[PDB]
Design a protein around this nucleic acid. Structure first.
Lengths: 283, 97, 94, 78, 103, 93, 105, 83, 97
DNA sequence: ATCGATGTATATATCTGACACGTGCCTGGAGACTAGGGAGTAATCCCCTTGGCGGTTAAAACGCGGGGGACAGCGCGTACGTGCGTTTAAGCGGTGCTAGAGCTGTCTACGACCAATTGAGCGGCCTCGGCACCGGGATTCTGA
DNA sequence: TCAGAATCCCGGTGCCGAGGCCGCTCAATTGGTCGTAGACAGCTCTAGCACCGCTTAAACGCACGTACGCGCTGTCCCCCGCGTTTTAACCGCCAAGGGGATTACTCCCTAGTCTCCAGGCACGTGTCAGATATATACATCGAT
């Protein structure tokens, strides 16, 4: 039932950020009260002005515990003062000036790297609604019923049962998922490897991520931007590229995407990634 | 990079053989048809469908003629077509004496 | 005014051969013109045959020989077979 | 207006025919050929219109002119 | 009706009337329209079958002049029957001379 | 049985043009077949014109238009002039 | 004069042409002027061909027209050759023509 | 009476004469077989129509008019032999 | 004892056979050929002499025209000898099979 | 150049059979009359062809580098041409038989034409479901 | 290697043939009633087929040489690819009125029919244009 935790609305728009295509386990169950699973339990997310709201299940449900609260808030990364950055972005970028004077409160969140990787693998040339449905199907089909959770690294593959995933609507992405799931096990160090990429430089993490099947430049950029803590990363999604065309352009191919990302990083500085999200959720 | 000469020609051939739209611009061809027509009879009127049929027939005729002149050029062991090829093709097809 | 065309019968044959398939108006026009062209060819050839043989009438025989003249080998044989089948069936119930 | 048949249009027509490389004078040669063909068809079409006492060249007139030329055309009448 | 009796789908009456008014001959036997309608129906069925097969090859459910052109030119028999005719919006059969291909 | 051809008239014109020249039998046969072929062409074109125009009678205008369609260049002009002259003379009496 | 050919001033058989037009089954009705026009056209074409053929025969020193002379007259002229471009004339032969490239050096 | 192999009756010098009437000065060795094949195809095409015409009239003798009509319908009008 | 250089007698032969107009294929072989072809369509037919004459005349005319077109192609390819590929090109361009 | 061999065109003479001319006659063309409907002519309608304007933006036009294809020389070896002697069989002229092409007589089964009847099919909206294409938080695959 | 294409599926457009009723033409049927086209049975005699011998022109086989078709190399120039500037094609929309189609009416031209008769066809004849044969004077090609 009702819970509250101090953080100003300007720091985060919990009402809007969640369906913005970063994590696909979030969808409405109660009005203005988003529901989704993380840390193998279900949470409800809304916000008030002087505090946020975050409540959990226990029938003896009254309030959440400090450890769960801090885990979810860390997921939100709320320990960074996001609001002030408009002071640096409005004056460093002319278009982000108009974005800042329009609306406020968009940031990035930290889900598990495995969830980020697989969700964005399912996101190749797809719409957010379909990726949401596809993830809900894949989790139900394979991962445990915790709303169904992500499966294990090994349990995501099997004895050539990879045709099963195609029955979920996964399409051509099933081959990607199967090959990448087998590779992360048979030629990489699993969770410690993924953490290593969380503690590896930007270009090294980029190169390491791009080497696996099913993930390209843009998916790797998204994994670096969220769940691997690389705020300088500026993913080039179709919305980003179109906004670039309608805002400012000079010159798509891998070289062009590299140059575009380099220029965007040069413009929005070290925290470019977080700025991109504000621009992204504008459409 | 820079595509080597002749490679874009192949993709152009594939592109224009797979599709079926018209290749000649409509208005210039219509104007040409009227300019030729006024010689035989002044102040003629043309149904839109009539000019469409004329354009379709002319394009089909020219495409066939180029297919034949290309065969001629290849027969001469050349790859580039030249006016002598068109003259040979028309002469053989009986369009010239 | 009232314009006669084969757009009804051609469609009837289509659903008899390819039940799922449909046909666009542009192709229906192509089919109608094609049917008219072949009818004109066969009728003209039958007329010339009757004129050559001093006959005043064109009958099933003239149409048969005209079909054999105009169509290529396999097509002519199948068309002749179908025409003979149709004529025999029709005359079976006078 | 024969000079209105643009060079790239002749190139596209040649491409549809399977041509790979085109000489410089092919453009003038093609323009001459097209002019001759159009004159031949249009004379017969205009003759048909004059015969019917009309002054609007009808699609059927073009179709009949082409058919008499041994270049039958489908899709416009019969 | 005569179309029903002969088992055909084409109109025997219309074919008979056209053979009459067309002024092809002074008289028109009873068997001529039936035979002619049967032949026309056969040819239409054949070309429509080929066109439908071509359309299915292209993952389309409608026959369009492109499919008619493909069916006509890919069939060695129809091609001879309809060699001289041009089909509006027909295009041409994909064909590039082997000598022109890259080494 | 009785056969008929144009051999009498083809010779009549010949004598009118070249009085001293003769014509061999095979040449006369070729001329006869040529006349038949031209007559067939013009008649067929006139019939098709009449059918196109929905009209049922072959008049002089149909012949004139068929000639204009079939004969090339100066032949069309001269033949049309000759036909018009003949028709006018015929109608004058 | 009785005959229609005499009235029209023609040499060709107007009456026979009228019969052929009717019996040939070209149309339901035949105009009164169509036989005259057609006969005049045929006579003009025949006169043209025979004029050219007689010219050719005189060029050859012969007095009788033979298929060779008809072939020469038809092929040498530039508009008849387009009227009869796909017609084979028995015992016709061909026009003397040797391509330039083949001539001796 | 059965017949066979008569295609070779179109001798090499006959092909040479036909080519010379065409203005050909120098002839290859492989031209003859191709010419014989072409002639056989053309004769088959003409004679098929001629035989069809003869069959229609219930005759058993292929008359000159049948050949002339077969050629005429093939767009190869012939003069001097009939019609 | 004399010998002309190559091509001189061929030119004389060309002049001879373009100036005269007789037939060039022997009669009896062609008659046997047409009868042999006829066997495949209907049995024991009988041929009018004029029918075989017309067949032979048309065949020779067609072959002469084909050889003229072949010579045109051979010259176009900078050659003087006619070769099977030339005949195939002429046939293909004419629309024949 | 120069001269010789072979070929071609040109002269002159004989004989013949193919074409020009004459005669008979019959059947198809011409003359005369009726009629009825096909074609000419006048009015009306509305639709669809010409004409114009503004913008946007796709295609055309122009310039330049240079890569490779066209074209010219040269060499060679074998495929073709020319010519001679030898062998085949096509062409010519006769003799003989008969299949069937062509024509005549007929009479009946068919088609033309008419009157009375109705439903097959055409034109007009209407309502579709349905088809075709695009686009989506790109990546992989493929060829230059 | 860095450009272009293809992959799965859901949703959103947007057009658009396919029934569907409805009304109604008109022409396609059904049933009769006649006139003649031609299917059939004969009969005639043309011409197509078979074979037979004879002559000699034509085709075959082979030898020898050279010229030309093929391959290779080198030059060089001119089309392709690409980028940038320019222009007019296309799309939409609105207006005017020219003429193409309809309808009605009217009459004069063609079809049909019945008498005659003379123009063209079949047959027969004569003679001269040309095919054949002998004579040779000039032309062109190849050797020198």
């Amino acid at each position: 039932l009702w819970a509250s935790i101090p953080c100003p609305r300007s720091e985060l728009r919990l009402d809007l950020v969640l369906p913005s295509g970063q994590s696909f386990r979030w969808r409405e169950q109660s009005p203005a009260h988003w529901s989704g699973v993380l840390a193998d339990q279900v949470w409800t997310l809304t916000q008030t002005e002087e505090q946020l709201h975050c409540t959990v299940y226990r029938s003896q449900a009254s309030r959440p515990t400090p450890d769960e609260l801090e885990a979810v808030r860390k997921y939100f990364q709320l320990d960074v003062t996001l609001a002030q950055l408009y002071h640096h972005w409005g004056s460093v970028d002319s278009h982000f000036q108009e974005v800042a004077q329009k609306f406020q409160g968009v940031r990035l969140l930290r889900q598990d790297p495995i969830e980020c990787l697989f969700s964005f693998i399912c996101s190749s040339n797809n719409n957010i609604a379909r990726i949401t449905g596809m993830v809900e199907r894949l989790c139900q089909a394979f991962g445990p019923r915790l709303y169904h959770g992500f499966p294990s690294l090994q349990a995501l593959a099997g004895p050539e049962v990879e045709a099963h995933l195609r029955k979920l609507g996964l399409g051509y992405r099933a081959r990607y998922v199967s090959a990448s799931a087998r590779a992360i096990l048979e030629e990489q160090g699993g969770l410690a490897w993924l953490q290593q990429l969380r503690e590896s430089s930007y270009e090294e993490a980029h190169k390491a991520l791009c080497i696996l099947p099913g993930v390209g430049t843009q998916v790797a950029d998204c994994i670096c931007l969220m769940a691997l803590d690389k705020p300088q990363a500026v993913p080039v999604d179709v919305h980003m590229w179109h906004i670039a065309q309608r805002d400012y352009s000079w010159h798509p191919s891998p070289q062009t995407n590299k140059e575009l990302g380099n220029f965007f990083r040069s413009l929005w500085g070290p925290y470019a990634g977080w700025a991109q999200a504000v621009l992204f959720s504008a459409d | 990079h820079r595509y080597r000469p002749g490679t874009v020609a192949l993709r152009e051939i594939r592109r224009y053989q797979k599709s079926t739209e018209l290749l000649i611009r409509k208005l210039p061809f219509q104007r040409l048809v009227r300019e030729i027509a006024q010689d035989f009879k002044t102040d003629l009127r043309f149904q839109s469908a009539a000019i469409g049929a004329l354009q379709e027939a002319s394009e089909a005729y020219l495409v066939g003629l180029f297919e034949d002149t290309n065969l001629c050029a290849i027969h001469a062991k050349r790859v580039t077509i030249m006016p002598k090829d068109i003259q040979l093709a028309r002469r053989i097809r009986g369009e010239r004496a | 005014s009232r314009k006669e065309s084969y757009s009804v019968y051609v469609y009837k044959v289509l659903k008899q051969v390819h039940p799922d398939t449909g046909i666009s108006s542009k192709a229906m026009g192509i089919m109608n013109s094609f049917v008219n062209d072949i009818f004109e060819r066969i009728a003209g050839e039958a007329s010339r045959l009757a004129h050559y043989n001093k006959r005043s009438t064109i009958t099933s025989r003239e149409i048969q020989t005209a079909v054999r003249l105009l169509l290529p080998g396999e097509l002519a044989k199948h068309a002749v077979s179908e025409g003979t089948k149709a004529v025999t069936k029709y005359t079976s119930s006078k | 207006n024969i000079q209105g048949i643009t060079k790239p249009a002749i190139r596209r027509l040649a491409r549809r025919g399977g041509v790979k490389r085109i000489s410089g004078l092919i453009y003038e040669e093609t323009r001459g050929v097209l002019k001759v063909f159009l004159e031949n068809v249009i004379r017969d079409a205009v003759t048909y219109t004059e015969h019917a006492k009309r002054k609007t060249v009808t699609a059927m007139d073009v179709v009949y002119a082409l058919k008499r030329q041994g270049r039958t055309l489908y899709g416009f009448g019969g | 009706s005569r179309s029903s009796r002969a088992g055909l789908q084409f109109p025997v009456g219309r074919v008979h009337r056209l053979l009459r008014k067309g002024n092809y001959a002074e008289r028109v036997g009873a068997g001529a329209p039936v035979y002619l309608a049967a032949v026309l129906e056969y040819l239409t069925a054949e070309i429509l079958e080929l066109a439908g097969n071509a359309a299915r090859d292209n993952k389309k459910t409608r026959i369009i002049p492109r499919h008619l052109q493909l069916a006509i030119r890919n069939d060695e028999e129809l091609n001879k029957l309809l060699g001289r005719v041009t089909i509006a919006q027909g295009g041409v059969l994909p064909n590039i001379q082997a000598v022109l291909l890259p080494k």
